[PDB]
């Protein structure tokens, strides 16, 4: 039942995202409501989060692949829909496998940007 509910919610959110994409093409991305400016964000992370690196492509693309278990998939998407991961950057979900990969990539991004600030603050 949880799997079915999560899948339907994702589909509904994606459908709403397409409808909102029509309106951001009319009034720019502010003029919708607060709710439809949180739907867009969590539904611009779902789209980025649906991409997965395949182990078969390790040689060509270099990046190591991921095999996401079904249990992880349901929880990972379920948490995103509720809004638990509303502070993670959008790009952390692009070509990553599982929720843990999202978090580790966030560490590598937050720490990476830390050096950039110390550089840009200095020099």
């Amino acid at each position: 039942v949880d799997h079915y509910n999560v899948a339907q919610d994702v589909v509904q959110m994606l459908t709403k995202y397409r409808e909102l994409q029509d309106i951001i093409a009319v009034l720019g991305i502010d003029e919708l409501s607060e709710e439809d400016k949180l739907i867009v964000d969590r539904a611009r992370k779902l789209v980025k989060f649906l991409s997965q690196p395949f182990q078969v492509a390790e040689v060509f693309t270099g990046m190591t692949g991921h095999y996401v278990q079904l249990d992880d998939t349901i929880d990972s998407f379920s948490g995103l829909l509720m809004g638990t991961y509303d502070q993670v950057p959008e790009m952390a979900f692009y070509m990553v496998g599982g929720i843990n990969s999202v978090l580790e990539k966030a560490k590598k991004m937050a720490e990476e940007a830390a050096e950039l600030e110390k550089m840009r603050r200095a020099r």
């Binding site: 638990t84 991961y85 502070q87 843990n100 978090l103 966030a106 560490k107 937050a110 830390a114």
Partner: peptide, 30 residues
């Protein structure tokens, strides 16, 4: 007021999520 008075795999995600966001706040500070 009473609620304030009173107070494993999922913990790791919470730890990482908290720690991940900990640096995001620190970078903003300085």
């Amino acid at each position: 007021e009473a609620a304030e008075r009173n107070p494993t795999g999922d913990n790791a995600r919470d730890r990482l999520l908290k720690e991940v966001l900990a640096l995001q706040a620190r970078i903003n500070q300085r």
